[PDB]
Amino acid sequence: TSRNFSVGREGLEYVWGNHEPVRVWAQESAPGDPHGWPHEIIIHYYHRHPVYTVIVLCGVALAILVGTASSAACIAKARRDCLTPYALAPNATVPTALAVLCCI
Amino acid sequence: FEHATTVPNVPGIPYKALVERAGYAPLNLEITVVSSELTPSTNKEYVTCKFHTVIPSPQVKCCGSLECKASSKADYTCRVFGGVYPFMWGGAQCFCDSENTQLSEAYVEFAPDCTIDHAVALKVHTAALKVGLRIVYGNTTAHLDTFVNGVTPGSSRDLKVIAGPISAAFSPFDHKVVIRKGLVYNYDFPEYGAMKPGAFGDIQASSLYATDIVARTDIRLLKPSVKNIHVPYTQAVSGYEMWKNNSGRPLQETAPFGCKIEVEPLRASNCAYGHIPISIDIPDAAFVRSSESPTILEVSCTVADCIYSADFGGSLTLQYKADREGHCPVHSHSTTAVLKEATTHVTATGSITLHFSTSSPQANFIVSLCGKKTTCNAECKPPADHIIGEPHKVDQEFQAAVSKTSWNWLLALFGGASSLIVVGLIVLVCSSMLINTRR
């Protein structure tokens, strides 16, 4: 027959028949390069620490998204409250220098 | 003088530390846990084995009655029957037709072969730890044993080693343990004096040769039916045999941390867990004045290639220049890279190759050759062998466990995500004060 045993970094010891015990420790030979392109980085570190990689990736994605949204909201608010006070006020002309610096 | 260190409790992997004093050449320090023992204080409760019932010859009276007496033998049972009229080879043995009274006895005793096949019940207190080190300093080697308590000065000759308290208190034995033919089982045996028939400890005594055996095996005596003399009886199954059949697996194969259970006295050997805060008092004789030791004018390190494997899967070399010759110590000032050599000869100009090991994908540690710290950096690839037969020599870190490129990617992403918000903030505030000053 054949048996599959999972051995971690701490080690595994098995005794077969009347033989002396032997010990084996697992190395971090995950597939993919931990030193190359980002997708290889991701797959290697996933195969090493799956939950940690998923957590850090969700964290970085949330960090970029929430904060791109913040910058967009800030610039939009600045745009509106900058063109409202007198530029939106009618019967008036707004100079090009003070218009196109943030217009469009 | 005094050095405080924290060596991991792994039996066999060396530990390298560098100790130095002003005006004195640095000295290599090597600590090894050669062997460890975990001896708990034990108290013997009783001794049990497979009982052997003894049925004495019946006593009968032709025309009369008998009264059951009290005896000190284990599980003594007595019964009296009213009419028997017994027979043997030769015919009837009494003249009364119905006034024949028969008395039956049955007690238990240790089987003759119990001197070899017998179990011992034990109670174990707090476990104590004792280790044997192989401290190496200078060009000398010392061996010594000490107790890991924080107060015992276990010293070979003048080492004055004080091993502090263990980081975590762990003991593979529960409160109650059972020993049988060198195999140690974690069992909850019944307390002395309270024996349940058909289970472990149905018969117990303070010693195999004690005369005060006590037992409770649920002996039942029955009314004789056949004509010839007989003592019918029924009894529970031997609880010792039942426990032997349902033993389970021993501590030699259940205990964690790779402990090796052994007996006489009961103990656990070569367990791997926690850390030991040692403290060494090195005699001043070993230390050598800095003026005598050769000095390095310059040193540059270059590393060939590296894999963060458990073994010494790494290489390193360095150029050096010195005004003298002698022996100098080499040390790696990092917690994720350990050298193999402790000292190495030096001859003016030349180059020395040193092997190391690491568990990080960056050989970005500091190497000193009797001083003169130097910076190495390499491109550590992962190893190819999935499985190795040697424990890891360095605990995995985190801050160093991540590659430089991945660190750069995450840093750049977070930096942009933190920069766009602040630039939006500042433009917002400048426009807001502009608008406030508008009117």
UniProtKB/Swiss-Prot annotation, chain A:
Superkingdom to which the source organism belongs: Viruses
Location of the region described as Transient transmembrane before p62-6K protein processing in the Swiss-Prot/TrEMBL record: 84-104
Region Interaction with the capsid protein, annotated ranges: 77-81
Post-translational modification as stated in the protein's UniProt record: Palmitoylated via thioester bonds. These palmitoylations may induce disruption of the C-terminus transmembrane. This would result in the reorientation of E2 C-terminus from lumenal to cytoplasmic side.
Function description: Plays an essential role in viral attachment to target host cell, by binding to the cell receptor PCDH10. Some specific strains may also bind host receptors VLDLR and LRP8/APOER2. Synthesized as a pE2 precursor which is processed by furin at the cell membrane just before virion budding, giving rise to E2-E1 heterodimer. The pE2-E1 heterodimer is stable, whereas E2-E1 is unstable and dissociate at low pH. pE2 is processed at the last step, presumably to avoid E1 fusion activation before its final export to cell surface.
Annotated membrane topology: Single-pass type I membrane protein
S-palmitoyl cysteine lipid attachment residues: 82, 102-103
S-S pairs: 82-103
Protein name, as recorded: Spike glycoprotein E2
Residues in the Cytoplasmic compartment per record: 76-104
Positions of transmembrane segments: 55-75
Subunit structure: Interacts with spike glycoprotein E1. Processing of the precursor of protein E3/E2 into E2 and E3 results in a heterodimer of the spike glycoproteins E2 and E1. Spike at virion surface are constituted of a trimer of E2-E1 heterodimers. Interacts with 6K protein. The E2-E1 heterodimer interacts with host PCDH10 (via domain Cadherin 1); this interaction mediates viral entry to the host cell.
Compartment(s): Virion membrane; Host cell membrane
Glycan-bearing residues: 4
Curated annotation (Swiss-Prot), chain B:
PTM annotation: N-glycosylated.
Cytoplasmic side, ranges: 430-439
Residues bearing attached sugar chains per UniProt: 139, 245, 270
Extracellular side: 13-408
UniProt region (E1 fusion peptide loop), positions on chain: 84-101
Localization (cell): Virion membrane; Host cell membrane
Membrane topology type: Single-pass type I membrane protein
Task of the protein: Class II viral fusion protein. Fusion activity is inactive as long as E1 is bound to E2 in mature virion. After virus attachment to target cell receptor PCDH10 and endocytosis, acidification of the endosome induce dissociation of E1/E2 heterodimer and concomitant trimerization of the E1 subunits. This E1 trimer is fusion active, and promotes release of viral nucleocapsid in cytoplasm after endosome and viral membrane fusion. Efficient fusion requires the presence of cholesterol and sphingolipid in the target membrane.
Protein name from the UniProt record: Spike glycoprotein E1
Organism lineage string: Viruses, Riboviria, Orthornavirae, Kitrinoviricota, Alsuviricetes
Subunit structure: Interacts with spike glycoprotein E2. The precursor of protein E3/E2 and E1 form a heterodimer shortly after synthesis. Processing of the precursor of protein E3/E2 into E2 and E3 results in a heterodimer of the spike glycoproteins E2 and E1. Spike at virion surface are constituted of three E2-E1 heterodimers. After target cell attachment and endocytosis, E1 change conformation to form homotrimers. Interacts with 6K protein.
Cystine residue pairs: 49-114, 62-94, 63-96, 68-78, 259-271, 301-376, 306-380, 328-370
Regions that span the bilayer: 409-429
